[PDB]
Design an enzyme around this catalytic site. Sequence first.
Site, PDB file in Angstrom:
ATOM      1  N   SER B  62       1.318  -2.521  11.401  1.00  0.00           N
ATOM      2  CA  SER B  62       0.392  -3.502  10.856  1.00  0.00           C
ATOM      3  C   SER B  62       1.105  -4.470   9.914  1.00  0.00           C
ATOM      4  CB  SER B  62      -0.745  -2.802  10.112  1.00  0.00           C
ATOM      5  OG  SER B  62      -1.499  -1.993  10.991  1.00  0.00           O
ATOM      6  N   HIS B  67       1.279 -10.238  -3.481  1.00  0.00           N
ATOM      7  CA  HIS B  67       0.954 -11.505  -4.118  1.00  0.00           C
ATOM      8  C   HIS B  67       1.220 -11.233  -5.598  1.00  0.00           C
ATOM      9  CE1 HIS B  67      -0.886 -12.765  -0.354  1.00  0.00           C
ATOM     10  NE2 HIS B  67      -1.619 -11.665  -0.344  1.00  0.00           N
ATOM     11  N   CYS B  82       0.493   1.936  11.197  1.00  0.00           N
ATOM     12  CA  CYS B  82      -0.250   2.617  12.258  1.00  0.00           C
ATOM     13  C   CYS B  82       0.528   3.808  12.803  1.00  0.00           C
ATOM     14  CB  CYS B  82      -0.541   1.646  13.406  1.00  0.00           C
ATOM     15  SG  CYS B  82      -1.426   0.158  12.912  1.00  0.00           S
TER      16      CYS B  82
END
Lengths: 120, 120
Positions: B62, B67, B82
């Site tokens: 994935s 941030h 995953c």
Amino acid sequence: AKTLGLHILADLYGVDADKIDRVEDIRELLEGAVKYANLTKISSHYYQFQPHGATGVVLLASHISIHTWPEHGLATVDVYTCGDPSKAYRAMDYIITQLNPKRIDKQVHERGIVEEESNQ
Amino acid sequence: AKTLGLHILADLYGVDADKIDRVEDIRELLEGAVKYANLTKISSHYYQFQPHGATGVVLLASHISIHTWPEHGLATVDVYTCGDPSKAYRAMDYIITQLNPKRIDKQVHERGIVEEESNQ
Ligand SMILES: [Ca+2]
Ligand SMILES: [Ca+2]
Ligand SMILES: [Mg+2]
Ligand SMILES: [Mg+2]
């Protein structure tokens, strides 16, 4: 105290395999979400998995992501924006209506809590 | 029933501004997480914000995202893999130890639940 960002994640079930099997689909979908939500994009990146399914991520000026599994009629979506919560909601409403899932599991998180008053 | 993926998200506080102000920092950090967790990368994208702070996203084969807000000693991290849950945990353990935050808010989600038995 205010939140710096709102992050919505949802696992969509019962999604038609044809709506989430190729990159073209994800690209149209996310481009459509960004415009509908009036979000500004920095860049966008997609990946085609074999025999199908795709990943799509958009860096915002946080991010929007989607991973899919056609064989399971499943798509996992993330809409994380900073500042304007209504845009995150609009983006997710758009994505969901376009994919029209039969069942949904959703959750919302306020990411990053900071003070509005400082100690003088 | 099994989960197709494990998604860990954490908001890290009390992080030194110098550890999260430029892209160079995020890049080293995420490259380090990927290798430490033995994850395989598809691609990686970074963005430098003014006057500082950056976004970093890695599409896995994935995703991992971060941030940052130097002025708030804050970094919001996502490690979504995953199949191998231990890799998601290792990646997040690495990122956290490198950033060495003073306070943390974390949550884990199993994304996408599918049946192991089908109806015959
Ligand atoms: Ca796009
Ligand atoms: Ca990298
Ligand atoms: Mg299609
Ligand atoms: Mg630095």
